[PDB]
RNA sequence: CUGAUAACUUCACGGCGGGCUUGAUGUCCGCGUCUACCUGGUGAACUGCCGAGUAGGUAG
């Protein structure tokens, strides 16, 4: 709003904490379409508690504010609800250099994400690459395009309509040093978008 | 601008009955710990009287 230098032009992310598990997802009884009301058909699902702390690098030289620095983060992280505890709000801060960034963390557990650079063009070559320390993930890194984009009217804000698949790359884990093993940024090569250490 | 926004799974529930692990059994022989060795009070809390009194009171 103020300041419009911010940039953040890349992050860095540390999972504390994961735990995944089946709990499913109760809908709300909408219309089936002539008169009866009635819940909509049955999925199955898989949900998860993520505990995790960010150390971002902007272009802005100092902080915001602490009156308004709670006030302008979201309470969303894919379709999740993502807070921070309110004895907590000391410790964010703007720090100079990444090496006293660590030790300001009251946290203290690691795994840095990085991505798997070597090649898995199929999935046996993937599976052939899980099984030595097995605290391995294989996430969602980007979409691959099919359309060029084109237009057409009932978009997302007048945009413009492409269409795109996923693309199922590996995620590893560091003990934690040069920091541009980490820092993912995004880009785009014209046919993909892919979340990129820079 | 997060495969976007929204999303109360729940009620009841007696695993019980019975059961002999035992018999026998030689651990022993031999064996040199020794040599050497300064904890110091600088001078430093005196001289008397009474009490039959290693106890007890005095004056300076």
Redesign the pocket.
């Known amino acids: 709003r103020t300041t419009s230098s911010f940039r953040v032009e890349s992050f860095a992310i540390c999972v504390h904490q994961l735990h995944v598990e089946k ?6 009884f ?1 219309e089936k379409g002539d008169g009866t009301i009635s819940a909509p058909a049955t999925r199955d699902d898989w949900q998860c508690d993520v505990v995790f702390s960010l150390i971002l690098n902007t272009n802005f030289a100092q902080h915001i504010d602490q009156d308004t620095l709670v006030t302008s983060l ?7 609800s ?1 807070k921070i505890a309110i004895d907590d709000f000391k410790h964010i801060n703007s720090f100079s250099t990444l090496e006293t960034a660590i030790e300001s963390l009251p946290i203290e557990a690691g795994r840095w994400l990085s991505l798997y650079a070597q090649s898995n063009n199929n999935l046996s070559d993937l599976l052939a690459a899980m099984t030595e320390d097995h605290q391995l993930m294989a996430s ?1 890194v980007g979409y691959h395009l099919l359309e060029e984009p084109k237009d057409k009217p009932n978009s ?2 007048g945009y413009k309509h492409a269409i795109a698949e ?1 693309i199922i790359g590996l995620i590893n884990s560091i003990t934690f040093t040069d920091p541009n093993t980490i820092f993912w940024s995004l880009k785009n090569y014209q046919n993909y978008l892919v979340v990129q250490p820079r």
């Open positions: 709990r499913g997802l109760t809908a709300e909408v979201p309470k969303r992280l894919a379709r999740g993502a969602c997302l804000r996923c």
